[PDB]
Amino acid sequence: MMKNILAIQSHVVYGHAGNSAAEFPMRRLGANVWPLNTVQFSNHTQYGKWTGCVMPPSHLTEIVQGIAAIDKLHTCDAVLSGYLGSAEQGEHILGIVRQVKAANPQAKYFCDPVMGHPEKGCIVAPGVAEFHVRHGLPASDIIAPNLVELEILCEHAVNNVEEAVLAARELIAQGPQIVLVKHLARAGYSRDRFEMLLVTADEAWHISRPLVDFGMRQPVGVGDVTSGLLLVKLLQGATLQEALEHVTAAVYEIMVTTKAMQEYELQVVAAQDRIAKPEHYFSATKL
Amino acid sequence: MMKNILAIQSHVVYGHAGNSAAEFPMRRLGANVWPLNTVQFSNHTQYGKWTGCVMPPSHLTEIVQGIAAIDKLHTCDAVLSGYLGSAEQGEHILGIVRQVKAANPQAKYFCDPVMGHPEKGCIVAPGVAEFHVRHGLPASDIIAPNLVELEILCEHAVNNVEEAVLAARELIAQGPQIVLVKHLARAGYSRDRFEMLLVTADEAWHISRPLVDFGMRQPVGVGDVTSGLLLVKLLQGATLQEALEHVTAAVYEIMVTTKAMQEYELQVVAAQDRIAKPEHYFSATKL
Ligand SMILES: *C(=O)c1c(CO)cnc(C)c1O
Ligand SMILES: Cc1ncc(CO)c(C=O)c1O
């Protein structure tokens, strides 16, 4: 009884980012992924250049009508969206979630509010952030912002774990039942490691792993993998703790392989056996 | 060094066919796949209906210009083409193959001349067939036609295994060094078995496996998976016999899992472990 996820995000022909980074790892974990690509780019934006195009918003709507047309929309367990090529796609993606839920009221909407962080190298189109803030957030059942996005969504700064657990709950209040702060940064207990947070209304778990020295060029996609894998674990019945721990270790595995190979692109394929069964163990802490 | 394959063929959001059928198994076997999708369809054409779009020919070329721009083309080890959305995509693909070859002279063009049966089978645009006999064939280093495609490519009927090895070699005289007759059908020893042929100027190998009964609804993508895995096997050093034995066993596992699950869509994900490590053994015969 495999889980089916309609993942609506970017696709790069060369390299990994969005669906190009998330799809394979998710399938290696035994889940089905229906990749509805939002763009088809030659490579990701951190290169400072890339060719390709943005799928028109109406194309995305037309794709799902086709899936409904063959009577399969009801088999979808979740809709995950991530990097959008334009703000107008957002609106159609919400119509999609509405249709998916009409066909399956248990389907969940997983919103990874990928906003543009030009300094880190991620280029996102204008209007996309406002979309997450005013429409995406309220419509989501699960949301996964990094620290910056958290601030943009709750509309105020966050400077520690306590404030993060609080800010997350401000979002939960607006709709999502689960919040994944996929990168605490300065707001974590230690800024010398990688920290994440998985918060619900009644509970909150903390996890961390070591930062991997990549210098002036961190590999794109860590957060897309993290989001993809988390949705997969939860849909499969993993507890909040189990989900967080497996996901943290698997990503670290991809991390070390990528660095060992002296590669800039996340090595999701080479590290595949350790995504399924990672060898490193990282402990979560219930706050 | 992990092998890199630029695969130019279809993408379906729901289901498996083209890159959506071949990509996962290829990566599962440890190769990288750069998927340059020739279309983004809701499902495969054999449902009798679908939505989505064809990528414009120029789109295929600009994507590759993009990969060249970041200086990565030279890492491409092979260009694989399969289902094309239009006849003009073919021309651009041959431009792509020359570009990849100028950057990496050892790179190979693998042509799976999908011509379809636009009536009772696979729905392919008019003129694609013509592109294959005219250009695909002579530009290709490896070509994998099924029985109908072979007859069309050599311009004559083929009625048994020996005429097939013969027709394959008439193609080799036109350009490729390797021919995979991906399904012998009526031209094999028996129609009660799935047969294939891997042929070169000096040798030829025949292999068979049991048929898997799906009634009237025959799963799509078996040929796409077979070609991709053969390319991966060959690029990573397998002998003709090794390549053929592994690909035949692996595809068979996918088929038995598809049947056991009573699925119409090739279960390339459910059977992933038996793709890398098949539990069935099929012996190839050197003619
Ligand atoms: C044939 O149904 C088909 C192929 C051939 O495997 C590849 N892509 C698509 C979309 C279709 O329909
Ligand atoms: C194309 C593309 N898609 C997704 C992301 C990050 O989720 C990036 C980050 O740079 C990107 O460039």
Nearest-angstrom CA–CA distance, B199 and B167: 10
Atom of ligand 2 nearest to the CA of A20: 3
Q: How many CB pairs under 8 A join A and B?
A: 125
Instruction: Name the β-bridge partners of A174.
Output: none
Identify whether the C-beta of residue A84 lies closer than 8 Å to the C-beta of residue A124.
yes
Nearest-angstrom CA–CA distance, A219 and A103: 37
Show Cβ contacts of residue A239 under 8 Å, excluding neighbours closer than 6 positions: none
**Looking at residue B74, what DSSP letter applies?**
G
Residues of B in contact with A43 (CB under 8 A): 66-67, 70, 72
Residues of B in contact with A11 (CB under 8 A): 35, 37
Nearest-angstrom CA–CA distance, B88 and B101: 20
Kindly report the CATH class assigned to A1-287.
Answer: alpha beta
**Looking at residue B110, what DSSP letter applies?**
E
**Looking at residue B47, what DSSP letter applies?**
G
A8 C-beta closer than 6 A to ligand 2: no
Measure the N-to-C terminal CA separation of chain A; round to a whole number of Å: 33
Of all ligands present, the nearest one to the C-alpha of A113 is 2
Identify whether the C-beta of residue B240 lies closer than 8 Å to the C-beta of residue B267.
no
Nearest to A41 by CA among A72, A60, A66, A20: A20
A144 marked as binding residue: yes
Of all ligands present, the nearest one to the C-alpha of B42 is 1
- Give the sheet arrangement for strand B108-111, strand by strand: B52-54, B32-41, B4-12, B78-81, B108-111, B142-143, B178-181, B193-199, B204-210, B285-286
Within 10 Å of residue A277's Cβ, how many Cβ atoms? 10
Q: What stretches of chain B adopt beta strand conformation (E)?
A: 4-12, 32-41, 52-54, 78-81, 108-111, 142-143, 178-181, 193-199, 204-210, 285-286
> Residues A234, A238, A243, CA angle at the centre, nearest 5°?
75
Nearest to B272 by CA among B253, B256, B252: B253
Nearest-angstrom CA–CA distance, B15 and B219: 10
Nearest to A226 by CA among A277, A268, A175: A268
Show Cβ contacts of residue B72 under 8 Å, excluding neighbours closer than 6 positions: A14, A43
The tokens of A233 are what? 């674990």
The tokens of A254 are what? 């991809």
B39: burial class by Cβ within 10 Å (0-12, 13-18, 19+)? buried
Nearest-angstrom CA–CA distance, A171 and A136: 11
Identify whether the C-beta of residue B144 lies closer than 8 Å to the C-beta of residue B113.
yes
The tokens of A216 are what? 């002036």
The residue contributing the CA closest to ligand 2 atom 10 is A122
The tokens of B196 are what? 């294939």
Identify whether the C-beta of residue B208 lies closer than 8 Å to the C-beta of residue B282.
yes
Nearest to B48 by CA among B163, B217, B254: B217
Closest-CA residue in chain A for B29? A269
Identify whether the C-beta of residue B141 lies closer than 8 Å to the C-beta of residue B79.
no
The tokens of A139 are what? 């419509």
The tokens of B168 are what? 């394959």
CA dihedral A264, B33, B101, B251 (to 10 degrees): 150
Alpha carbon separation from A135 to A138, A201, B162 (Å, rounded):
6, 21, 65
- For testing the chain A interface, which of B3, B28, B41, B51 should be mutated: the one with the most A CBs within 10 Å? B51
Domain ranges of chain A: 1-287
Resolution of the experimental structure, in angstroms: 2.2
Identify whether the C-beta of residue A99 lies closer than 8 Å to the C-beta of residue A73.
yes
Of all ligands present, the nearest one to the C-alpha of A14 is 2
- Ligand 1 geometric centre to CA of A1 (Å): 26
Identify whether the C-beta of residue B142 lies closer than 8 Å to the C-beta of residue B234.
yes
The tokens of A192 are what? 């010398």
Instruction: Identify the helix (H) or strand (E) that includes residue B44.
Output: none
A11:B35 CB<8 A: yes
Secondary structure (DSSP) of chain A: ---EEEEEE--BSSS-STHHHHHHHHHHTT-EEEEEESEEESS-GGGS---EEEPPHHHHHHHHHHHHHTT-GGG--EEEE---SSHHHHHHHHHHHHHHHHH-TT-EEEE-----BTTTTB---TTHHHHIIIIIHHH-SEE---HHHHHHHHTS---SHHHHHHHHHHHHHTS-SEEEES--GGGSS-TTSEEEEEE-SS-EEEEEE------S-PPTTHHHHHHHHHHHHHHTT--HHHHHHHHHHHHHHHHHHHHHTT-SS--TTTTTHHHHS-S-----EE-
Nearest-angstrom CA–CA distance, A28 and A11: 18
**Minimal C-alpha gap between A11 and chain B (Å):** 9
Three-state secondary structure call for residue B194: strand
**Looking at residue B13, what DSSP letter applies?**
S
Measure the N-to-C terminal CA separation of chain B; round to a whole number of Å: 33
Q: What residue type is assigned to position B69 of the chain?
A: A
Cα diameter, chain B:
51
Identify whether the C-beta of residue A116 lies closer than 8 Å to the C-beta of residue A129.
yes
Nearest-angstrom CA–CA distance, A144 and A182: 6
Secondary structure (DSSP) of B117-165: -TTTS----TTHHHHIIIIIHHH-SEE---HHHHHHHHTS---SHHHHH
Identify whether the C-beta of residue B199 lies closer than 8 Å to the C-beta of residue B179.
yes
B209 marked as binding residue: yes
A6:B28 CB<8 A: no
- Ligand 1 geometric centre to CA of B146 (Å): 14
Show Cβ contacts of residue B277 under 8 Å, excluding neighbours closer than 6 positions: none
Within 10 Å of residue A226's Cβ, how many Cβ atoms? 26
Within 10 Å of residue A159's Cβ, how many Cβ atoms? 11
The residue contributing the CA closest to ligand 1 atom 2 is B122
Smallest Cβ distance to A269: which of B27, B42, B269?
Answer: B27
Nearest-angstrom CA–CA distance, B42 and A68: 9
Based on its alpha-carbon atoms, the radius of gyration of chain B, rounded to whole angstroms, reads 17
Nearest to B175 by CA among B205, B133, B228: B133
Three-state secondary structure call for residue B36: strand
Q: What residue type is assigned to position A262 of the chain?
A: Q
Strand pairing class (B193-199; B178-181): antiparallel
Atom of ligand 1 nearest to the CA of B222: 6
Show Cβ contacts of residue B49 under 8 Å, excluding neighbours closer than 6 positions: A66, A69, A70
> Residues A86, A112, A264, CA angle at the centre, nearest 5°?
85
Question: If you search the block for the tokens 């792509």, which residue do you land on?
Answer: B96
- Which experimental technique did the depositors report for determining this structure? X-ray
A9 marked as binding residue: no
The tokens of B154 are what? 């050599």
Nearest to B233 by CA among B222, B244, B224: B244
The tokens of B110 are what? 């693998």
Alpha carbon separation from A174 to A95, A159, A164 (Å, rounded):
19, 21, 16
